[PDB]
Structure formats: structure tokens, C-alpha cells
Symmetry: D2
Subunit: 505 residues, 4 copies
């Protein structure tokens, strides 16, 4: 009857439903890029493969994408159990990085508090960085930094303070540590002039169209003009690639609504965000963006350091278990793993842990309160909209095993997902890209029908409907005698305006 | 967002869109049994004709019934405009009445020694001796019991008991010919279904009434009796338990479950229980019937001053509006249409008030409460019906068109109280008439023959509803509507479509 | 947990609290003006005496006011049980009335549908009205009426239609009936030019100041300028007389907020209102005005035909019982009886019936939902405001027998009443006018302390506090061992900012 | 109005007014026991000092306690700025630990044959033989039981049982010197209060600790034991039941009622129950403690990465904020302050996050829920406290000033969660220290002598609170505050006053 009361009723012994609704995005790298590991990644719950273009070459990422597809297509030959896997390109963007440490002896020079460290832009030191001279790739740094400005290195773990300036920078180490090679540099409060879409970004995005990626995670989006530039580079033939704008700076937060209108989805990139803005404020930015994306019906991803300790450990910290649960409770459509699957020692346990936590968090959601709050914040005239709210309400009413949705664009399924049913949304599609991109929206279980299209539209409709029925049975979503809502089109669909309540045969 | 902010924004200059959804039940008597007047009352908004069997002969009511059907079928030429009219039987029940005065009245004043005797010699009654028809009245009540006569207006308290009753008048007044008696705080052993009740109930079965208003229902046992009396030939006649004594209120939950509907019979209830409490019982019963999805009627003295005057009082206008706001499926007129001088105006007044009160309901708050309190079931029709009402709100629908043979699908929609009218297409004439018990259901009777192709017969009946809604001003071409059908000859299918 | 659920829990066998919170205003007339009947009127529940100045003379109303005070002061000599009684002046206002029927033979000429009735303004027929010629006192009627306009007579029971005009009016009777003498005439939809404050009104209001009336019920207020004129005539020496603006025309509804800001309170005068505007719309106007008066903290009276059948019958109709209950449920501070106590055969039963119904309706109110809705619609900086909301919340928390309030203006008590506690508000005052006017606000039980003011402010405070304790005990509001909230002043009160929770000794 | 609209409006550029209300509990160890560092941790926001008695000697902890009190009383010169610091004893409890390796580690890999023996010859441990300290481990678990070692990181399943345990390694790893063992899905007969527990609990009584964190509380029986062990001399020491196994969660309601508070001890709980479920248990327990008005602590690994790094991870920042949003009275740091390289920064980080999360709470929604769920009682102090919190919201108060000797009045205010700080004026030094268990209570210790006139002594202590609030930036002269006092030497009086 109230949020506190429902929160008092939570029971660790009540088991969740079989379906896990939140998507899991795994950054692929050396720990996960083999075909055989990728097969186990999919079996453990991976829905999207993220490729970070801050590193690597096109030849290298081309191979990974080929291995990702090879592992994905091995589970074909059973369309009932086949799980679509999407491919995401994450851009480098206007990123600032140090150079390579001097390779003589060991790596990781030690930076000590109070020590002086000169920062240079002279490429003679580009591969000879040490505890005296440090090179970085931002060629205009000595025009957006002043005496007293603080420079952050390696995920903000190292802080520096500019003590002298020049057309170099003499700093003093404030927070000390071990300095590795090519580490990320953040300049909070400074107006970094780097472009939104660099020359490399153009190249990386065009390679994304040739590789038929399903979505782009665009880094450091500060405003809608940045999103439009990504959109233009993708141009036509990239027109269906979803753009997920990553919010990781203060301007991106302040201009979020502008960015959200231009974008197909949002990523809370808390790594960069928590250095650019004070780390105590990230939770406010996350919940605001997830809430705003929820009311707009647009996918939102929670990212960056969700299970960070599982790079080295087989079990997460209690904060990391809490973070994944709270992100699902916040309403995130997808959760992300970055170094935990790309480079760490326990990538499959990390994927498995996210699957377990998210399923338990989905059970803990007070569904009607969300549904009522989502209904209030939206009286439109779209029959497919009304059909979607009606299908969700009918699903609570009869405790539906699933809402089966027939769509080739995904829009019909996406509209159901906005209203957050408990029952899984089995989205039957013949479009493979739609099956892949459907993982961006919580609760959609994309199934790719490969049967040839029947002569009678009515016979083709129950074919795809029946296929959803065998899909749901085999995966444990429902059994015979249960009831499911089926959403189909008007006539040879258009408006998705035909809802039925069907017992499972 | 809150109820207070909703009242604060009620606007008298906002004209009510959305034609009237609450059914109007009109008691027929001498001032309205004319075919001509009955035709005008249908035009004014009558949906159900009530025949009070506390008075009159079987021959008299059967001729009223014949006139009702004559006036109703005079409009049958146009199925688009035809408004079905139901017929209701209101029983006598365990009524205690008084004797005939030596037609004129006598005057009893306070302190007077009024005596009550069951010896039927006195049946044909002075300010000294009063004959009652309840021969076991004694020992049912005792010292200073407070018996009431003539609508509670005349009060009396007992002084001495016997085999006969010696009483002292508490509240005086005039008349005393066949006037009713109430014994509050007493257990009248008189049974719910008397011989006149069984014979009258059998008369309704043969007269093909659509529903029965069973007076003085005290317990579920009394509903089951009425049902088995109506028998196999009267299975489909709906039984509305009238609640008009304290026992009926105390056992309401069991009476509701056994019944098809409830009437708040405020006339007797306001005597059997303190008058300052009728409002509590009325809102309690209407609320529970709303939660149960069963029809509830508010009745008795809603526009009482219009028996003699062409406009109602301010209290009467409030009472009709608040009954609708309470959640009543039907409002009722008894003497205002049976014996009054302005029966047409009373029907028109209830039409005007009910439509203003319907437009003042916070519909989406009421729907959400009924959605939130809806039990979880596996009936696809219930699931379809909740979804259809949710859909109708999100797309601000012009109507919900429901195809049904028994009415159950339309009733399930009406339980969740959509703002949009429910056009119920049926081939069953009784279903069309019975649909008037549920708020929002606008029944239309299809007389076109059953096409062999199932999908063609659906498309015929849906097209019929489209024509009805366009003709009645419910919606226009291009407006969005919801259509509820089956696909397996379960009403499990909802389509959100523009109007052709 | 919801309004429907609470409404399903209503129990006719749960008895209400002893205190009845809604005020009862009784119009005094021949049926009620004797001292002895007035004594029984007070004992039956009368809190305000309304004197209608549409009729009578000053000499006549002076006697009634004297008898009202005589009956009121007989219960003095016990300040514990003494009940203050307020006196209200109801103005004639811009009222239109027919003349006197020809006295030859019997009264009540019969007007028949289709008959012609000439309306004249020639005073030769002023006392010779019949079924052929009818006189009325609006001298400019034939400039605000046109052919086809409808004229209403005797509470709208008779309707006429102007068929010919002139510097007379030839009409045809539409709704027929018996025509009595000096009956009220309404002209809906016409711009009646009669002044808001006539010469008679000025006289009647000045007589009200000399008679020390507590409030004015101003008829036919259409706008704030009308209220200001009443305020000016009362002027100084009338400054503390509360003005209750009666809303009984369409303009008064349309300009209600303007009127409410200028007025000290509002009366829904449904008699005239239900003729001026369609009778099916009165309930909308009533609930809107009562709601708006509730959120503004200003008294609202429901009036006119609440128990109309009890003019002639000893028991009301079911609609009349419903009307009184629903008016209390709507939130009306006071309910009114007009002809039921002024001229009818059962004035004491009518007063008693209103007391019984209102007490049962007060029990049926879902108090927390009102309190929360009243809290949301109002964060001010007034400590006496905060103290009042805190006292009400504390009263629900401990099921207080009463909230004792020490005030000489009543404002402190009025602020408690706005938030609608269940517990009665025992307002201890030494001001007699405050004790009388306190009946305008639901839940305030004014008690007039006549003890001489003590030397020590602290000793005077518990004196008045203890007096409230003996008041509450004797009237059945609480007993020893119960708990009551007491509201007192800061220091020798100012801000009413001292709340206590006290066990009853 | 809704929660979604509230999140949608959260603004990172709105700076938090209203100083931090959630208490910070810091475990003291080698990296923080210095008087100098302890002085800086008080300045950084430490409110309670936790001494883990799973390690260390009585002499060691007593010197830590002495240093805590040395650093705390260094600020005693100014009673306006003095921040009382409490001392907490965390017991060992029924801990199963392992033997010392022949300090260095050994490497166990999957499939390996690790044997467990209770013969204490092996106590001083190879990749072949592992000695446990729980001599009755056998028959408490059986085939393939899944025993866990070293924070759950190393997993093992049994193969053969005996009087000794033969196991196959499931999850490998390094080390093995005095590392903890957990047996999920098992009923360790080991008792809640061991001999070391009773002796350590008696040491706290003599060391004048303010509270006890009782490890591995499984049932109300275990709380009552701790209380009677603490005895008459330890009546006022508050007992916080740590919930860290499945039985403690299943019997939470009975443990809560017997306890003065609850700690969510997530370290062990995340091993004893599946890790994906700790969030459910944490929000369940915090919610029930909030409803009961009893302190609840969130603990264990909140900023774990700051043992080695000067900034926390994004998951750690979320965890602290969501704990505050859950409704935790206190947040806790264990190894981050006991043995880490950045103990001051960890305390500072929890201060920053908690104050941001406090400013993000929909306070009036949370208060209304606690008001709505508040039981109806006749205690004037409860009634005063709800009224004072309602008053503080309506007038946007700068503080609620509560005079109290035992703390009960301030706790009753804190139960209803006002936004305004609660300044609790007390002459009882233990009450001031114990006040840190409840969110919002800012304790100030009065050392001025008791004036003979009662009203003068009140006016002294209220004036002291006014000076504290002005000095700490809580409010300024002219701001509105609420003061709660008694009049009969019951805190039954509320005055809404400007600040002098
Ligand atoms: O029988 C009835 O209708 C009544 O009592 O009102
Ligand atoms: O003991 C503890 O604090 C735990 O298990 O987290
Ligand atoms: Mg990148
Ligand atoms: Mg009856
Ligand atoms: Mg008047
Ligand atoms: Mg532990």
C-alpha cells in the first residue's frame, strides 16, 4: 500500500521468475574474444557485445566481431533456443590520454605527493614517459589550463596541480600513485576544445557501417549538435544504427534533455562522469537520467565499474552487488560490464552475477506503482500505444506468462516495454537487426522467425504466434494451460492494435 | 491529483459530453400506464419499467406490461434508434399493513389510547381500535416497543401486551387505510416469500419479466428461495435483493454473493434503521457492489416533491447527483412516475442530473481504484475487459463495442467504469433489456440473420454498432473505438480501430 | 487504503463521537421566535439565528433578537454548559417580488398552462394581483426582458413566457400553479440592473450594527465590488461583523474567487441558485465552492431546502437526509434551515435531525485523506499555522479527546479547524463576539470564560485551560486519564505557538 | 508528486544545504588508532568508533579506546563545537577460522584434494591438510556441502565425512592463515555468546562502551543472552544485533523486538545467503527498523576499494547513497579505516555522499508514510514528536531542539525523519554519544550546572542549543525553530520560536 510497506515485505526466500528482463552488455577484449569463451558468454547471459574503439585496430575488432557472430550463429539450428546478440561500437571521442612509459626495466613509475612532474606535448617523449616528464595527446592543453588547475590521471586516481605554464606544464603531484601507459586524463572545469567527432571517429563510425553494427555508444556527447554529427557520419546506410549518447561530463548532464531528444538512447558512463563531476553526485545524475529516459520510452544503460573487483576476484563486493540491483531498481534497461569481461580473470562469473542480481531486482519492483506512475506521466491517440498499455494491464490482471508481440520494427514491443510489464515480452520478428537491437529495451526477448512467409496472412500470424508459444515453453516462461497476451497487426500489420488473451495450448 | 483539487475545478458552464450512462428505473402506475405516456417516457430516458406488486391485480399489471411493450416496440422500426426497455417485478414481501377506516381518515394525537387487535371484525378502524394484518405481531415486540405507521410518520409505543396490543401515540397525524407498519429492532417471523410472492413471481415468469426486485431480503437463504421459486423457466431472470431492514445490512455480504444485484430500498430502510444512518448504508452497499461488479440501484424519494411540483427541491437534485457519484448503476423513481402529476419531468430531471454527475466523476481515479482492487484471475474475458478499459482511457475512446450473447462480457467491462459508452451488440432480446442494470452499457439488438461465415457475422454486428454510435452522436467517422470480440465461436480479442 | 475501500467499511452500527462539529443555522420566524421555543432550539442544537430581512420590520426583528438573547442567556449561570448563539442578518438584496393577491374570497389564484397573464408595474394593482393582472416591484423589468424570455415565480415553480412587451408585459403561462402573495421572481439570463446595496439594504445593515449582530449574509453578491459596498455601509463600528457572501446567481459563480477573497465566508444559497442556473448544475457549484472555501480556510454554509418536507412532516425524505449528510461530507462548515424552522410545524425535529445526520456524517469522513489533501494544497512561515497543523497531527496520533485552544480573536482556533481534526476544538475565549462567530468554523466549540483575569499570566493560562477541562468532561467529550492537546500563547499571547499534550486530570 | 517525477528533477548542481544527518561508524585499527589521526577523523565526520574484537587483545583495544577519548576530549574546550564520539564493541561470535600456514600462503587449485582435520597438530597447514577451529564441523554438513574459505573467495565441496572432512576444491586461490569459514545452509551449533564473547562483553562494561555490535545473532534468545551478560552495570549499553546468516533474516522480527538496533552485516550475510539476495535483505531490514523507530546500520565493503586507492569506485559511491536512500541511520567503514592507506578520505567520502543522498530524499513523502504507518498510542511524547515533525515541515524549520536526559524524546522525533536537524541537549554524556545511532540527532552535552529554578534551567539549555545551531551554521537569528521540553520535571511541550 506504500513504498516502505512493500519494502518491508521483501523476502529473500521468494524465488524470482525465470525470465531476466534487463539487458547485459559485455565489453569484449582479450579475456572474452575467443569463439569458445564467447559461446559461454552468450550462455551466461550476454545480450550485447561492446567493442571499445579507444583501443585496438580495425583488423583486431573485425576479428572479434567475426568471432562474436561465429559464437552467436552456433546456437542457430534451433530458432526456439537461439538468442540474438547485438554488436555495439563505442567511440574514442574527444579523449585525452598519456603516452607510453619508458620500457627500460619495469613498468609503472611511482608518482609521490609533493613531487614535481613536468607535462610535455613534445612527441620525443611520447613513448618515454616517466616520473619526471609526462606526455599527453591534447595539443591545446596549455590554452585551457591555468595555474592552480587540477589534472587527473588513470580514472582520477592520480591528481596533479599546475604550478607553471608554457607553450609545457610543470605540475606538483597531489594524489600519488603508479603511472601506467596511455592512461586517461580528465580536465574538470576546463573548456576542452577537442572535437566531438574527430577524424578517427569518422573512420571508426564508417567501419561500423561496413561491419553492420547495431548501435553506437558515442562518447562525451555534450549537446545535440554532437549527436547530429554522429548521425551525419553514419548517414544513409547507417540510418537504422541506434545512437546511444554517453553522458560523461557536466555539459552533457546540463543539456541532457536536448541530447535525449536527438538520441535513440542514453548511457550513464559513470567512469568519466565521476571524475568530471564530484563523485558524490553521480547517483543523482544516474537516477535523473534513468527516470527521464523511462518517461520518454528511450533505452538507458548503466555502465562502468558495476562489478569492478571481479576483474581479479571470483565474487563481487557487497557494494557491487548493491549497485547492480539498485540500477535495475532505478529502471535501467541494460547494465554494462567493461574491464570485468574485456580483460579480467572471471568474465563468465561477472556475466553470471549480473544475470542473478538483475533477476532478483526485477522481482523486487513494486510493479503497479511504476505502471501507475508511468501511466500518469504519459492520453495519446496512438492505437498501438493504447493497445500496449492495455496489454500490460491485462498481463497483471491474469498473471500472464508472456506478452507475445509480432513486430518487424520492434516499435510495438518497445511500447510495451516502456510500461514495464512483469511478464516477458516475446517479440517475434523476421528482421534480424530488430531482433538484435531489441536487447536495448528491458523485458523484450527477441526471437527470430526464419520460417518462410505463409500464403495466408492469417496463417502466417498464428505461425509466428505458435512459434512464440514453443519459445516460451522451452525456456520456462510458461506451460500449457497458462494464459498469454498476443499482440498482432490490424490487417495485412500497420497499427499494432489487436490484443488477445489466449490460453497456452 | 487530489479529490479536493478535482471538486475545486468543477465547472457549471462545461456542458456534459458523453450521453447518460446511469440507468433510470421508473415505477409505472395510473399516471404513466398509457401507451402514449409510456412512449414519451422512453423518449425521456426510461430504461426499466418497475411494477410494484404490493398493490394491484395480475390483470392490471399485465395490461401495464402490455402497454410498456406496445410503446417500446413502436420504436422497433429503426434498430439503430431502438432503445430496449426492461420489465421489473417488485414483490410485496413481509409487509405489515393496516385496516380500512370506516376511505377517509381519522385523527390520532399524542397520548391517545390506540389499541391494536388482530380480530378481523375491526378490519373494516377508528382512533380507538386499529386492525393489523400480521396476526403474530404480539410477542415479536414488547414494552414500549415503538411501532411505526404510514411511512414512519405516525409513531406509537406499546403499553400492554397479550395474545392484543395497547399503545400510546408518540407522533400523531391523520389517515389510516391500508397503511404500512414497521417494527424496528424486531425479528418479524413473517417469511421473505409469501403465497402472494410465489404466485406473483410465477406470474412474472409467464409475463417474461427481465428482473425481480425482492423486497425485505434479510439473508442469503431468502435469495435462494426466490431463485428456486423462479425455477428452471426463470433461470435467466435477474434477482435484485432489496435491502430495507437492519438484518439485510448486517448480512449484506452473504446477500450480495447470492444475488445478481442490490437495491438500496431507502423508504423502509429509513424506518427500520435510524434515518441519520441511511446514507452510511447506501454508500457502503454501493461501494461493495461496485467492487463485486454487480448492479446496485438507489431508490425511494429521490425526487419526491415532483409528485406535486414541476421542479424538484435542492435536496432532491443533490440526492440524484450524489447517488451517481456514489457509484449507483441505476436511479429509481417510484411515486413520481406511478401516481404523480409530473412523471415525464421527473424522468427528464433524473436524466439531466445523472449526466451532469457522470461528467463530474474523476474517472481515471475510480478506474485505478477498481483496477487496483481487481482480483487476479485467469479468465481471458476479465483480462480483455480490464485491458479494454485501460485502452479506452489512454486513447480517449469514443466507445467500447462489445459483442455478447449473455451480456457477461459487457458487464465485465462496466465493472471497471470506463468513461466511454459500452455499445453491447446482442441477438438475445432479454440480454439487451437486462443490460440496463449496469452503468454505461448501451444495448443494441441485432435482428439481422446469422451469416454462415463467422468473421462475416462479427463484421455485420460490429458495423451495426458503428452505425448506432454514429447515429446517436456517440462517435463520428475517424474517431477511435475499441471493439471486443471472440475469435473462437470467450470474448478475448480487443481491436482499437477508427470508425468507418 | 483507498476511498472505495473506506466507503466499503462504513458501519451503521459504529456509534459516532459525542461532539457534532458542523454548525446549524436556523432561520427564526413565527414558528421559532418565542423565548420558550428558542430555549428548546438551543437545546436541540442551534448555533446561529438567521433573521431574513426580505420580510418583516425592524421592530419585529428587534424583538426576535431580544428573545434569542433572552433564551441564550438563560443557560448562563453555568459557563461550563453555556452555549454561545450567534445572530445573523440576511439582507433582502436586489430581490424581485410580486404583489399581494386580491383579498376578495380566498387566496391563491390558479395559473393554467396556456393562459395569458399580463404583468404590470402600475401600483394600482400592487395589492390586487390575480390570474389576469400580476404586479411586480422591478420597475425596469421592461428593459431587460425581450419576447421569448422566460419569467419564473415562486421558487421557480411557475414559468411564464413574454409574448408582448411595452412600457407592461403580456405573457403566457407555461408551468401553471397556484399564485400566492409577494412571491419571489427570477429572471435567468437577463441583466437585472437592481443595485447590490439598495436604500433598504443600507437601513437594514445599519440596524444590524446597532443590534450588534455577529455576521451578515449578503444576498445576490455578483462581484467583489458588491462585497465592498456592504463592507463600507457597515464601516467602522461594523468592522468585526463577518460578511458571508451568498452565491445565488451565475455571475457570482463565475466570479467566485474574486468574491471569496473579499468575503469572510460563503453561503451556497441553492434556492435562488437553482433557478438562476439549471437545477442539475447546483451540485457542481456547491462542491466547487465548498472545496475552494476549504482550501482557503474560510467558512462555507450549505443552505436552502435541506429538510424541506419537514415544514409539514415530522420526518424528512430520504433525499433530504442524504443532502445533509453529503453537505457535511463535502466539507461545509455550517448547514442551514430556512422555512423548516421559521414557519413550519416541526422546527425542533428539523434542528434535531440536522444534529443527528451531521454527527453521523462527521464520523464517515476519511480524516487522514482530507488532512493530507489539505496539507498538500497549503510551507508557510506562520508559527501559529505550523502549531495548528502539528496540533491536528498530534490529535490523530493520540486520539485526542479535544484540542483546547486559547484565543481571543478566534484565529488560532480557526486555523486548527481548517485542517479538520476529528477531536473537537474547545476554544476558550473571554471575547463574547469571538465565542459567537466561532460557530462559523466546523469543530470549534466556543466556551466563554467569565472568570476575572488572574494576576499571573501563567495562572490565568491554566485557569482557562482547566475550565476547558471541566467543559469537556461535563459535555462528554473526554474523561480523566484521556489526553488533550492544549494550544496557548508564547508569552503575555501573540503567536499561538505553544502546543502541549496533556493527560486529563 | 510521484517518485519518478522526483528522480527526474534531481539536480547535481543544487548544493546540499542541511548538514549530514546519517551517522558514520569507523572501525579503528593500526592505520587510525593514533590520537593525531583520530583527531582528524573526528574533524572529517566520525561519530562512532568500532572496535572489532574478532582480533586483538584487551590491552590493545583499551589503548585504542583511550586514544579515541583523548582525541575526542581535545575538542572539549568549546562545548559549542564539541562533537561527542561513541565507542562500539563488535564481538567475535561463532566464527569458524582456519589454521596458520607453515604467515605466507599456499595455492589451492580446482579439483585438488583438500583435507580438513580438527587435530590441532596440523594447526601450525598445507595445500593437503587444513585445520579448522570448529571441532564439531563434521555432521553439521554432509555430501557436497559447499564450505567456503577466506571471505567466500575460496569454495570447497565435501567428498567424504567422518568423526574428518575430505573435500574437492571448487573455487581456488591463494593464502590460508587464520581465514574465516562459512557453512551456508547449515546449523552451526556454536553458540552466539562464547567465552571470549562474555569476557569481551565484560571488558566493554568496564571500558564504558556505549553500544555492542553482537555478531551472528540468529534468534531473540541470543539478544537476551547478551543483555543479561552485560548485566545491571551494562543496562544502558545499547545492543545492536548484527544480522549475517539466513536464520537471522528468517527470524528478524523477533530479533528486532529484543534489540535496540540492527546492523546489516553484509560481509558474512553475502556468503551465508546468495550474494544476489543481500540487497533484498538490506532493504527489508532497514524498512522494518524505520517502521519500528530503531536504529539500523549498513555496513561492510561500502568503500572497499579505498583501502588501496584515494577515490572509490562508481559502485561504492552508489552503495553509500542508496544505503542512505534505503533509510539507514548509520553507514559503516571497516577495513577502509582500520588498515587502509586512505582512512581519512574514506570518512570524508561517506560524509560527502550521505549529505548528497539526504538532500535527494522526498522528505515529506517519507514522513507521510511514517505518519500513516504510525501506531495510535497515548504517550504524550510520541504525540508531541509527530506534531513537532509535522510543524517542522509546514514552517520549514531550521532545527528541532529537544531537551532529553535518556534520549528517548530525540529518538521519537528521529523516527519520523524530519528534514531539520535534531539538536539534542543532554547532561548525560552517554546519551549524547548514544544519540549518534539515530539519523538526524545532533547531540550537544551541557556541562552548565542545574539552576534551582526549573524554568531557568530549561532556558539555559535551550539557549545553549541556540548558540550551537548558530555557531554550526544550522540556523541564523530570526530563523524559525521548534523546541521540545517538558513542563513537569514527559517531553510534552512544543514551542515554535524565532532564533534569538
Ligand atoms: O420498497 C422500497 O422500495 C423502499 O422501502 O424504499
Ligand atoms: O561482521 C560483519 O561486519 C560482516 O559480516 O559484514
Ligand atoms: Mg570509449
Ligand atoms: Mg419496501
Ligand atoms: Mg434574503
Ligand atoms: Mg561477521
Amino acid at each position: 500500500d506504500t513504498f516502505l510497506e512493500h519494502m518491508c515485505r521483501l523476502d529473500i526466500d521468494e524465488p524470482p521468475i525465470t525470465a531476466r528482463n534487463t539487458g547485459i552488455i559485455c565489453t569484449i577484449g582479450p579475456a572474452s574474444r575467443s569463439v569458445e569463451t564467447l559461446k559461454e558468454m552468450i550462455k551466461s547471459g550476454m545480450n550485447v557485445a561492446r567493442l571499445n574503439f579507444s583501443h585496438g585496430t580495425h583488423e583486431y575488432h573485425a576479428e572479434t566481431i567475426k568471432n562474436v557472430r561465429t559464437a552467436t550463429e552456433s546456437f542457430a539450428s534451433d530458432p526456439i533456443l537461439y538468442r540474438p546478440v547485438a554488436v555495439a561500437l563505442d567511440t574514442k571521442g574527444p579523449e585525452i590520454r598519456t603516452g607510453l612509459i619508458k620500457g627500460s626495466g619495469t613498468a609503472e613509475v611511482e608518482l609521490k605527493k609533493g613531487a614535481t612532474l613536468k607535462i610535455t606535448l613534445d612527441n620525443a617523449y611520447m613513448e618515454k614517459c616517466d616520473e619526471n616528464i609526462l606526455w599527453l595527446d591534447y595539443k591545446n592543453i596549455c590554452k585551457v589550463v591555468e595555474v592552480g588547475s587540477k589534472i587527473y590521471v588513470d580514472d582520477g586516481l592520480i591528481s596533479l596541480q599546475v604550478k607553471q605554464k608554457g607553450a609545457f606544464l610543470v605540475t606538483e603531484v597531489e594524489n600519488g600513485g603508479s603511472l601506467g601507459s596511455k592512461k586517461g586524463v580528465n580536465l574538470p572545469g576546463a573548456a576542452v576544445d577537442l572535437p566531438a567527432v574527430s577524424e578517427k571517429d569518422i573512420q571508426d563510425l564508417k567501419f561500423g557501417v561496413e561491419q553492420d553494427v547495431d548501435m553506437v555508444f558515442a562518447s562525451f556527447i555534450r549537446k545535440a549538435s554532437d549527436v547530429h554529427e554522429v548521425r551525419k557520419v553514419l548517414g544513409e546506410k547507417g540510418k537504422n544504427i541506434k545512437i546511444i549518447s554517453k553522458i560523461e561530463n557536466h555539459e552533457g548532464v546540463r543539456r541532457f534533455d536536448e541530447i535525449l531528444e536527438a538520441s535513440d538512447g542514453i548511457m550513464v558512463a559513470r567512469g568519466d562522469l565521476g571524475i568530471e563531476i564530484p563523485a558524490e553526485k553521480v547517483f543523482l545524475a544516474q537516477k535523473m537520467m534513468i527516470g527521464r529516459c523511462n518517461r520518454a520510452g528511450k533505452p538507458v544503460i548503466c555502465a562502468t565499474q558495476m562489478l569492478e573487483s571481479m576483474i581479479k576476484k571470483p565474487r563481487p563486493t557487497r557494494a557491487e552487488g548493491s549497485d547492480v540491483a539498485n540500477a535495475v531498481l532505478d529502471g535501467a534497461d541494460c547494465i554494462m560490464l567493461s574491464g570485468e569481461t574485456a580483460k579480467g580473470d572471471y568474465p563468465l562469473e561477472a556475466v553470471r552475477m549480473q544475470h542473478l542480481i538483475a533477476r532478483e531486482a526485477e522481482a523486487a519492483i513494486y510493479h503497479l506503482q511504476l505502471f501507475e506512475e508511468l501511466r500518469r506521466l504519459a492520453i495519446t491517440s496512438d492505437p498501438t500505444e493504447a493497445t500496449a498499455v492495455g496489454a500490460v494491464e491485462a498481463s497483471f490482471k491474469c498473471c500472464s506468462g508472456a506478452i507475445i508481440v509480432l513486430t518487424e520494427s520492434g516499435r510495438s514491443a518497445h511500447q510495451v516495454a516502456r510500461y514495464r510489464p512483469r511478464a516477458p515480452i516475446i517479440a517475434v520478428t523476421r528482421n534480424p537487426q530488430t531482433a538484435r537491437q531489441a536487447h536495448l529495451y528491458r523485458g523484450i526477448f527477441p526471437v527470430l522467425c526464419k520460417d518462410p512467409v505463409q500464403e495466408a496472412w492469417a496463417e502466417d500470424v498464428d505461425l509466428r504466434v505458435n512459434f512464440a508459444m514453443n519459445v516460451g515453453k522451452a525456456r520456462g516462461f510458461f506451460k500449457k494451460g497458462d494464459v498469454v497476451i498476443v499482440l498482432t497487426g490490424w490487417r495485412p500489420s500497420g497499427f499494432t492494435n489487436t490484443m488477445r488473451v489466449v490460453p497456452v495450448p
